[PDB]
Amino acid sequence: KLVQLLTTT
Amino acid sequence: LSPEQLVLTLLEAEPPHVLISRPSAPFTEASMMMSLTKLADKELVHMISWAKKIPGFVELSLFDQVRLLESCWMEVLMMGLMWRSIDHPGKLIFAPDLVLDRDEGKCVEGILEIFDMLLATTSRFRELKLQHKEYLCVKAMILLNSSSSRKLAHLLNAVTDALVWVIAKSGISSQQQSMRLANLLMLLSHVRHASNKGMEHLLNMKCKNVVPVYDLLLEMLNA
Ligand SMILES: Oc1ccc(-c2cc3cc(O)ccc3o2)cc1
């Protein structure tokens, strides 16, 4: 969750 | 990148205004925690984007970006709450459709404690007449100072340099530029304190499953 938002725009 | 331009990019990183889509009406303990958790969850999404807009942040290791956010998120939320509440003494403007009074904090056990803390710190920033640009630098520092290593210190130093600059523009005495810098930074201790308490209270609410499951919020709360 935190990681996917940090790797997507 | 000069201090002024760095401050400008922080302004451009500002998350959008958030509402919880709740028809105006009195509050209860079940609806208050419902709204507070639902709001925090939404703001958390916008906070991630905000951080990525801070020059150099996405240049940090993935391990650092995660640990920085996981440890400071509540502080950043509460710092935002205080800036929004600055021009509304005696009120905590969590959201346009979520305005709370101190007595309303009595609907939930242990939250009145945290509200007073928030109201006090807010009142403090009010006395100092916190400026928007200062709010931008301060919030940025909270994230960067809530601990690739060198890159971080470099970034933290840049933002710190931006705060000094903002203070220098106010055109006040140098001695008063120092007094103001220290007073603004000393308040971060109170924001970090109201944060730890807000987490403890929230964690306790989770363990009791009194608040719905918000994937992002749950993840951030657990670690
Ligand atoms: O912008 C903000 C700032 C703070 C909160 C928030 C939710 C919440 C829940 C608790 O049990 C205790 C403290 C809290 O503070 C939510 C949004």
Coordinates of C-alpha atoms and ligand atoms in Angstrom, one line a residue:
Chain A
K1 CA 0.0 0.0 0.0
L2 CA 2.6 2.5 1.2
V3 CA 5.2 1.0 -1.2
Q4 CA 2.9 0.8 -4.2
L5 CA 1.9 4.5 -3.9
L6 CA 5.6 5.4 -3.6
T7 CA 6.2 3.6 -6.8
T8 CA 3.3 4.9 -8.9
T9 CA 1.8 8.2 -9.9
Chain B
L1 CA 17.9 25.7 -6.5
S2 CA 17.7 28.7 -4.2
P3 CA 15.7 28.8 -0.9
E4 CA 12.9 30.7 -2.5
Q5 CA 12.6 28.2 -5.3
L6 CA 12.7 25.3 -2.9
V7 CA 9.9 26.9 -0.9
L8 CA 8.0 27.3 -4.1
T9 CA 8.2 23.6 -4.9
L10 CA 6.9 22.8 -1.4
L11 CA 3.9 25.1 -2.1
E12 CA 3.4 23.1 -5.3
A13 CA 3.6 19.8 -3.4
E14 CA 0.8 20.9 -1.0
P15 CA -1.9 18.2 -0.9
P16 CA -5.4 19.2 -1.9
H17 CA -8.2 20.1 0.5
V18 CA -10.0 17.0 1.7
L19 CA -13.5 16.4 2.9
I20 CA -15.1 13.3 4.4
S21 CA -18.5 13.8 2.6
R22 CA -20.5 14.0 5.8
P23 CA -23.9 15.8 6.0
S24 CA -23.7 18.3 8.8
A25 CA -24.9 16.9 12.2
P26 CA -24.0 16.4 15.8
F27 CA -21.3 13.9 16.8
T28 CA -21.2 10.6 18.8
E29 CA -18.2 8.4 19.7
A30 CA -19.0 6.0 16.9
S31 CA -19.3 8.7 14.3
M32 CA -16.4 10.8 15.5
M33 CA -13.8 8.0 15.4
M34 CA -15.4 7.0 12.1
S35 CA -14.8 10.5 10.6
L36 CA -11.3 10.9 12.2
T37 CA -10.1 7.6 10.9
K38 CA -11.7 8.0 7.5
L39 CA -10.1 11.5 7.1
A40 CA -6.7 10.3 8.2
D41 CA -6.8 7.5 5.7
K42 CA -7.6 9.9 2.8
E43 CA -5.0 12.4 3.9
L44 CA -2.4 9.6 4.0
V45 CA -2.8 9.0 0.3
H46 CA -2.3 12.7 -0.5
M47 CA 0.7 12.8 1.9
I48 CA 2.6 10.1 0.0
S49 CA 2.2 12.2 -3.2
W50 CA 3.2 15.3 -1.3
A51 CA 6.5 13.7 -0.2
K52 CA 7.4 12.5 -3.7
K53 CA 7.1 16.1 -4.8
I54 CA 9.8 17.2 -2.4
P55 CA 13.0 17.5 -4.4
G56 CA 15.3 14.6 -3.8
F57 CA 12.9 12.5 -1.8
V58 CA 12.3 9.9 -4.6
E59 CA 16.1 9.9 -4.9
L60 CA 16.4 8.3 -1.5
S61 CA 16.5 4.6 -1.0
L62 CA 13.2 2.9 -0.8
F63 CA 14.0 1.8 2.7
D64 CA 14.4 5.4 3.8
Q65 CA 11.3 6.8 2.1
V66 CA 9.2 4.2 3.9
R67 CA 10.8 4.6 7.4
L68 CA 10.5 8.4 7.2
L69 CA 6.8 8.3 6.4
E70 CA 6.0 5.5 8.7
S71 CA 7.4 7.4 11.7
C72 CA 6.2 11.0 11.0
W73 CA 2.8 10.6 9.3
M74 CA 0.8 11.5 12.4
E75 CA 2.9 14.5 13.1
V76 CA 2.4 15.8 9.6
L77 CA -1.3 15.3 9.8
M78 CA -1.5 17.2 13.1
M79 CA 0.8 19.9 11.7
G80 CA -1.7 20.3 8.9
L81 CA -4.6 20.3 11.3
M82 CA -3.0 23.2 13.3
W83 CA -2.3 25.4 10.3
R84 CA -5.9 24.9 9.2
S85 CA -7.1 25.8 12.7
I86 CA -4.9 28.9 13.2
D87 CA -7.6 31.4 12.2
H88 CA -10.4 29.7 14.2
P89 CA -9.4 29.9 17.9
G90 CA -11.0 27.3 20.0
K91 CA -11.6 25.0 17.0
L92 CA -9.9 22.1 15.4
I93 CA -10.5 22.3 11.6
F94 CA -9.8 18.6 10.7
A95 CA -11.8 19.2 7.5
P96 CA -14.4 21.7 6.2
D97 CA -17.1 19.2 7.1
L98 CA -15.4 18.0 10.3
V99 CA -15.1 21.0 12.7
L100 CA -14.8 20.1 16.4
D101 CA -15.2 22.0 19.7
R102 CA -13.3 21.1 22.9
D103 CA -16.4 19.9 24.6
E104 CA -17.2 17.6 21.7
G105 CA -13.9 15.9 22.5
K106 CA -15.6 14.6 25.6
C107 CA -17.6 12.1 23.5
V108 CA -14.5 10.0 23.3
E109 CA -12.5 8.8 26.3
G110 CA -8.9 10.1 26.3
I111 CA -9.3 12.3 23.2
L112 CA -10.1 15.5 25.1
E113 CA -6.5 15.2 26.4
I114 CA -5.2 15.2 22.9
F115 CA -7.5 18.0 21.7
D116 CA -6.3 20.4 24.4
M117 CA -2.7 19.6 23.4
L118 CA -3.6 20.4 19.8
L119 CA -5.5 23.5 20.7
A120 CA -2.6 24.7 22.8
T121 CA 0.0 24.2 20.2
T122 CA -2.3 25.8 17.6
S123 CA -2.8 28.8 19.9
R124 CA 0.9 29.0 20.2
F125 CA 1.5 29.1 16.5
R126 CA -1.2 31.8 16.4
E127 CA 0.6 34.0 18.9
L128 CA 3.7 33.7 16.8
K129 CA 1.6 34.5 13.7
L130 CA 2.9 31.5 11.8
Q131 CA 3.2 32.3 8.1
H132 CA 2.2 29.9 5.3
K133 CA 5.7 29.6 3.9
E134 CA 7.0 28.8 7.4
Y135 CA 4.3 26.1 7.7
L136 CA 5.6 24.7 4.4
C137 CA 9.2 24.4 5.6
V138 CA 8.3 23.2 9.1
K139 CA 6.1 20.4 7.8
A140 CA 8.8 19.4 5.3
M141 CA 11.3 19.3 8.1
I142 CA 9.1 17.0 10.2
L143 CA 9.2 14.4 7.5
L144 CA 12.9 14.7 6.9
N145 CA 13.9 14.9 10.6
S146 CA 11.7 11.9 11.8
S147 CA 14.4 9.3 11.2
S148 CA 21.2 7.7 0.7
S149 CA 22.0 8.8 4.2
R150 CA 24.0 11.9 2.9
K151 CA 21.2 12.7 0.5
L152 CA 18.8 13.0 3.4
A153 CA 21.0 15.3 5.5
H154 CA 21.6 17.3 2.4
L155 CA 17.8 17.6 1.8
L156 CA 17.1 18.3 5.4
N157 CA 19.7 21.1 5.4
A158 CA 18.3 22.6 2.2
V159 CA 14.8 22.9 3.8
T160 CA 16.3 24.2 7.0
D161 CA 18.1 26.8 4.8
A162 CA 14.7 27.6 3.3
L163 CA 13.1 28.2 6.7
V164 CA 15.9 30.7 7.7
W165 CA 15.4 32.5 4.3
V166 CA 11.7 32.8 4.9
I167 CA 12.4 34.3 8.3
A168 CA 14.9 36.7 6.8
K169 CA 12.3 38.1 4.4
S170 CA 10.0 39.2 7.3
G171 CA 12.6 42.0 7.7
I172 CA 12.8 41.8 11.5
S173 CA 15.8 42.2 13.8
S174 CA 18.5 39.6 13.4
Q175 CA 18.2 38.8 17.2
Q176 CA 14.4 38.4 16.5
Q177 CA 15.2 36.2 13.5
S178 CA 17.0 33.9 15.8
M179 CA 14.3 34.1 18.5
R180 CA 11.6 33.2 16.0
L181 CA 13.6 30.4 14.5
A182 CA 14.1 28.7 17.9
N183 CA 10.4 29.3 18.9
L184 CA 9.1 27.7 15.8
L185 CA 11.5 24.7 16.1
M186 CA 10.8 24.3 19.8
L187 CA 7.1 23.8 19.0
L188 CA 8.0 20.7 16.9
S189 CA 8.5 19.0 20.3
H190 CA 4.9 19.6 21.2
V191 CA 3.7 18.4 17.8
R192 CA 5.7 15.2 18.3
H193 CA 4.3 14.8 21.8
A194 CA 0.6 15.2 20.7
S195 CA 1.5 12.7 18.0
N196 CA 2.8 9.9 20.2
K197 CA -0.4 10.4 22.3
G198 CA -2.6 10.4 19.3
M199 CA -1.1 7.2 18.0
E200 CA -1.4 5.5 21.4
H201 CA -5.1 6.5 21.6
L202 CA -5.7 5.4 18.0
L203 CA -3.8 2.1 18.4
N204 CA -6.0 1.4 21.4
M205 CA -9.1 2.1 19.3
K206 CA -7.9 -0.4 16.6
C207 CA -7.2 -3.2 19.0
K208 CA -10.9 -2.9 20.0
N209 CA -12.0 -2.9 16.4
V210 CA -14.1 0.2 17.2
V211 CA -12.9 1.9 14.0
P212 CA -13.5 0.4 10.5
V213 CA -10.6 -1.1 8.6
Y214 CA -8.7 1.4 6.5
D215 CA -5.9 -0.5 4.7
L216 CA -3.5 2.4 4.4
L217 CA -4.2 3.7 7.9
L218 CA -3.9 0.2 9.4
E219 CA -0.6 -0.4 7.7
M220 CA 0.8 2.9 8.9
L221 CA -0.5 2.3 12.4
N222 CA 1.0 -1.2 12.7
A223 CA 4.5 0.0 11.6
Ligands
LIG1 O1 -5.4 15.9 9.8 C1 -5.7 15.0 10.8 C2 -5.0 15.1 12.0 C3 -5.2 14.2 13.0 C4 -6.2 13.1 12.9 C5 -6.4 12.2 13.9 C6 -7.2 11.0 13.9 C7 -7.1 10.5 15.2 C8 -7.7 9.4 15.9 C9 -7.4 9.1 17.3 O2 -7.9 8.0 17.9 C10 -6.6 10.0 18.0 C11 -6.0 11.2 17.3 C12 -6.3 11.4 16.0 O3 -5.9 12.4 15.1 C13 -6.8 13.0 11.6 C14 -6.6 13.9 10.5

